[PDB]
């Protein structure tokens, strides 16, 4: 289930983080706007940019912590506040996060593996709700 899935993702985190974040940027091309330097790049080109691998892995490092500290896929309000307040997220609306989680669930559904895609979908929804509550537009 959810907790095992955190262990699975952490076991190959660099490759899952890149592959899910590329899935997100390819499904929702307008989202590359937040990351100007990513425009006009193939997946392979992106995977060779230092910044890409480092920000993607740090996103997933913190996403897995937030998932790990959740009760029944409901994240801590303190984690939601941290995400809303980060000055790298000044731009962002819950829609940015909704789309990331749609791509993540899709990725899990398409994978050969017994990911608990329904739990991730609930986690995404509950995070978006927690982010709204903590004051994200
Ligand atoms: C659970 C979801 C997310 C987590 C845990 C998260 C976490 C982080 C972390 C830890 C950083 C600092 C990384 C660094 O600067 O090296 C960061 C930066 C950033 N995040 Fe997020 N993030 C999430 C979702 C999003 C989404 C959905 C977007 C945009 C659609 C986004 C856009 C950014 C941007 C633009 C930066 C800084 C720009 C840059 O790389 O120079 N984040 N995020
Ligand atoms: C996978 C991508 C493009 C990453 C998303 C978020 C951050 C912080 C760095 C880039």
The reply to whether ligand 1 has any atom less than 6 angstroms from the CB of 12 is no
User: Would you say 99 and 31 are in contact if contact means Cβ atoms under 8 Å apart?
Assistant: yes
> Which method resolved this structure?
X-ray
User: Would you say 83 and 105 are in contact if contact means Cβ atoms under 8 Å apart?
Assistant: no
Supply the residue whose CA is at minimum distance from atom 2 of ligand 2: 56
Q: Is 137 annotated as a binding residue?
A: no
User: Would you say 76 and 134 are in contact if contact means Cβ atoms under 8 Å apart?
Assistant: no
Under DSSP, the state recorded for 34 is G
DSSP symbols for 56-92: HHHHHHHHHHHHHH-BTTB--HHHHHHHHH-GGGTT-
User: Would you say 114 and 58 are in contact if contact means Cβ atoms under 8 Å apart?
Assistant: no
Which of 10, 36, 59, 61 best tests ligand 1's pocket when mutated (most atoms within 8 Å of CB)? 59
What tokens does 53 get? 């691998």
What is the CB neighbour count within 10 angstroms for residue 57? 17
CA 135 to chain centroid: 19
């Amino acid at each position: 289930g959810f907790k095992q899935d955190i262990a699975t993702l952490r076991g190959d985190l660099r490759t899952y983080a890149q592959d899910i974040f590329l899935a997100f940027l390819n499904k929702y091309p307008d989202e590359k706007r937040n990351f100007k330097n990513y425009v006009g790049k193939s997946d392979q080109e992106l995977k060779s940019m230092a910044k890409f691998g480092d920000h993607t892995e740090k996103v997933f490092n913190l996403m897995m912590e937030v998932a790990d500290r959740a009760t029944d896929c409901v994240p801590l309000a303190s984690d939601a506040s941290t995400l809303v307040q980060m000055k790298q997220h000044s731009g962002l609306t819950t829609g940015n996060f909704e789309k990331l989680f749609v791509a993540l669930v899709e990725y899990m559904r398409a994978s050969g593996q017994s990911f608990d895609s329904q739990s991730w979908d609930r986690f995404g929804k509950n995070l978006v709700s927690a982010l709204s509550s903590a004051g994200m537009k």
